[PDB]
Design an enzyme around this catalytic site. Structure first.
Site, mmCIF file in Angstrom:
data_model
loop_
_atom_site.group_PDB
_atom_site.id
_atom_site.type_symbol
_atom_site.label_atom_id
_atom_site.label_comp_id
_atom_site.label_asym_id
_atom_site.label_seq_id
_atom_site.Cartn_x
_atom_site.Cartn_y
_atom_site.Cartn_z
ATOM 1 N N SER A 198 54.012 43.253 27.648
ATOM 2 C CA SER A 198 53.186 42.375 28.476
ATOM 3 C C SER A 198 53.565 42.364 29.962
ATOM 4 C CB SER A 198 53.211 40.946 27.932
ATOM 5 O OG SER A 198 52.432 40.837 26.753
ATOM 6 N N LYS A 201 50.972 43.148 32.707
ATOM 7 C CA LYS A 201 49.949 42.192 33.122
ATOM 8 C C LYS A 201 50.043 41.801 34.599
ATOM 9 C CE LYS A 201 49.106 40.594 28.452
ATOM 10 N NZ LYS A 201 49.567 39.772 27.304
ATOM 11 N N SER A 258 50.761 34.837 29.029
ATOM 12 C CA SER A 258 50.719 36.143 28.381
ATOM 13 C C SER A 258 49.576 36.228 27.368
ATOM 14 C CB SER A 258 52.057 36.455 27.705
ATOM 15 O OG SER A 258 52.212 37.853 27.544
ATOM 16 N N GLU A 294 45.584 45.481 24.319
ATOM 17 C CA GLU A 294 46.308 44.523 23.496
ATOM 18 C C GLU A 294 45.636 44.458 22.129
ATOM 19 O OE1 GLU A 294 49.026 43.253 24.006
ATOM 20 O OE2 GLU A 294 49.378 42.737 26.108
ATOM 21 N N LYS A 362 57.610 37.839 34.806
ATOM 22 C CA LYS A 362 56.714 38.088 33.689
ATOM 23 C C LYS A 362 57.525 38.799 32.618
ATOM 24 C CE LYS A 362 53.039 38.273 31.240
ATOM 25 N NZ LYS A 362 53.981 38.154 30.089
ATOM 26 N N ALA A 365 57.435 41.396 25.072
ATOM 27 C CA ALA A 365 58.059 41.567 23.769
ATOM 28 C C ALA A 365 57.219 42.539 22.958
ATOM 29 C CB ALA A 365 58.165 40.234 23.055
#
Length: 416
Positions: A198, A201, A258, A294, A362, A365
């Site tokens: 993530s 992003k 997130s 995602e 940010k 995982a």
């Protein structure tokens, strides 16, 4: 018949760049070797002829060729303190941990003679600080023996990071970078690839802000989506199926929470992962790449280059986004503001951050024990450095991984 092989060896030694090219053009073996296994690349590295090293490499020279005494061109470059050549060799796939007949790695040589800059570059490419020569000595031990406290300190810091990762069966990489100048202050495996997870992003937000600056997008434009758009973990977007969300709200959700659906919705507006990668190429980042959406992008398959970056590339790109000329001052501030309001990275850097410090970050995982964070922070209420940390491959618990990153952060904070 003129022995072009030996003629090329001598041309490489003498620094005759034109003669090197002429011989190669006429069929000289770029990997010619004498009776000791010395090749043109060895001699170019030994003499310190950068241009010849480059020409040889771009035309098929074996970067890891070893002579009879186990010396690679990288050994010779490090022994004679040829910084630029060390860098070029590593960028072209040299084995950073090649051992000569005495068990010496390039890092041993750099530590022994006190070539601090070369020590740092070797660490960028994952040089093994635990490597022992035939006497059982590590580069650290050689630094101590020869009174190179400078190198000893840097090696000690690297060891703390590597040793912790080894215990978890993890591969770790990090970098500490100066926000203003872009100078690298500390790092390990910062030139190796890791899954972004993530953390991508923040780059996505940058791409959107670029469109906003261009007038292609509006922060207040309301995007309407449906239940079929929802993917795993969508804490914010799952609440606005009937009213929709603005581009601003989506960007906020993506960075601060997130939110996965929020990210996918924004990705769609720029043409998906290929669109984001195109934007990165415009930033001058030709290393980072997003290939999937995602949540598939978090698979973190070992040695898979999809959806990966390097710590140095991510840190450099983030610096450009927060301080560069590509985004307007208003947009640069907005990006920083979103990251400052991150509420899902509590267990990482924020768990060891002293009071009074500024942090905008940010986290990420992924599967296969993947964890990471990107951040701009500083001890005086404002950011002055960029820190990027990635770990992958341990299959460890979330708590273990959280502490791995937190302790690296603690080390950087104490040695600020």
């Amino acid at each position: 018949g003129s022995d072009l092989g030996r003629k090329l060896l001598e041309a490489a030694r003498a620094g005759q760049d034109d003669e090197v090219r002429i011989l190669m053009a006429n069929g000289a073996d770029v990997n010619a070797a004498d009776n000791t296994g010395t090749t043109p690349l060895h001699l170019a590295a030994y003499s310190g002829h950068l241009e010849i090293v480059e020409v040889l490499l771009k035309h098929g020279a074996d970067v890891d060729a070893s002579d009879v005494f186990g010396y690679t061109p990288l050994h010779l470059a490090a022994y004679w303190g040829h910084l630029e050549i060390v860098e070029v060799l590593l960028k072209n796939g040299a084995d950073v941990n090649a051992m000569d007949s005495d068990g010496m790695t390039p890092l041993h040589l750099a530590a022994k003679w006190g070539y601090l800059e070369i020590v740092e570059v070797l660490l960028k490419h994952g040089a093994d600080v635990n490597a022992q020569d035939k006497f059982g000595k590590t580069p650290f031990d050689l630094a101590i023996d020869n009174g190179n406290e400078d190198a000893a300190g840097v090696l000690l810091t690297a060891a703390k990071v590597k040793d912790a990762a080894d215990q978890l069966g993890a591969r770790v990489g990090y970098i500490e970078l100066d926000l203003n100048s872009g100078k690298i202050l500390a790092s390990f495996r910062s030139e190796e690839r890791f899954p972004m997870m993530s953390t991508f992003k923040v780059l996505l937000a940058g791409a959107i802000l670029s469109r906003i600056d261009a007038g292609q997008e509006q922060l207040g434009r309301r995007i309407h989506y449906s239940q079929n758009d929802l993917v795993e973990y969508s804490p914010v977007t799952e609440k606005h199926l009937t009213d929709g969300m603005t581009v601003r709200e989506l960007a906020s959700a993506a960075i601060t929470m997130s939110d996965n659906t929020a990210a996918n919705l924004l990705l769609t507006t720029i043409g998906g992962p290929k669109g984001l990668t195109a934007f990165l190429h415009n930033m001058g980042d030709h290393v980072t790449r997003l290939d999937r959406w995602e949540p598939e992008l978090n698979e973190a398959i070992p040695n898979d280059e999809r959806d990966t970056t390097t710590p140095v590339a991510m840190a450099t790109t983030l610096r450009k986004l927060l301080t560069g000329e590509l985004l307007t001052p208003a947009s640069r501030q907005q990006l920083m503001d979103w990251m400052e309001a991150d509420k899902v990275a509590g267990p990482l850097l924020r768990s060891v951050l002293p009071a009074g410090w500024f942090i905008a970050d940010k986290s990420g995982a992924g599967e296969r024990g993947s964890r990471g964070i990107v951040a701009a922070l500083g001890p005086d209420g404002k950011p002055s450095r960029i820190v990027v940390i990635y770990t992958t491959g341990s299959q460890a618990t979330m708590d273990e991984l959280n502490r791995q990153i937190a302790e690296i952060g603690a080390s950087l904070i104490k040695g600020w």
